Amino acid sequence: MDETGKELVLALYDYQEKSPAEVTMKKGDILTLLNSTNKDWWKVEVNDRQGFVPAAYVKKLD
Amino acid sequence: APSYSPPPPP
Numbered sequence: 001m002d003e004t005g006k007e008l009v010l011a012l013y014d015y016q017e018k019s020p021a022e023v024t025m026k027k028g029d030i031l032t033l034l035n036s037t038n039k040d041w042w043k044v045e046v047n048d049r050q051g052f053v054p055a056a057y058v059k060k061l062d
Numbered sequence: 063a064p065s066y067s068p069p070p071p072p
Contacts, residue, residue: 013072019064040068054068 003045007033008061015057023051031058 011029023046025031034050035043042055 015069021064035063038063041064043063052064054071056068056071 003048004030004032006045007036009033009042009044009058010061011053011057012059013057015053017051019052021052023049023053025053025057030061033060 009031011025011027011031014027015025017024023044025046029046031053032045033042034045036055038055040055041052042058043050043052044058
């Protein structure tokens with residue numbers, strides 16, 4: 001049960017999910033990267049929630 | 063994947 005055991009990212013700012021394919025993140029949270037094939041939106045996993053967030057709101061930790 | 067531009071960084 002280590003869904004956060006993947007490519008990690010840092011949440012630079014607070015974000016609120018707008019669509020069912022979006023997830024809410026908070027500044028200072030460590031997000032898990034699931035898909036970064038998009039330049040503007042990155043699919044991440046927070047705790048248990050999977051969805052997309054602004055790529056400009058997240059930074060590669062690795 | 064959202065087919066639109068994401069919100070600008072605050």
